[PDB]
Design a protein around this ligand. Structure first.
Ligand code: NA
Length: 34
């Protein structure tokens, strides 16, 4: 129960990291004029 709460807190940090990095990648790629 409590262990799962702490684990999910760690997992959420990981998910947010991934989402932010993906957003940055997409943004940078979208900057290149066509
Ligand atoms: Na963008």
């Amino acid at each position: 129960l409590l262990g799962d709460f702490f684990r999910k807190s760690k997992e959420k940090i990981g998910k947010e990291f991934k989402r932010i990095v993906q957003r940055i990648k997409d943004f940078l790629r979208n900057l290149v004029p066509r």
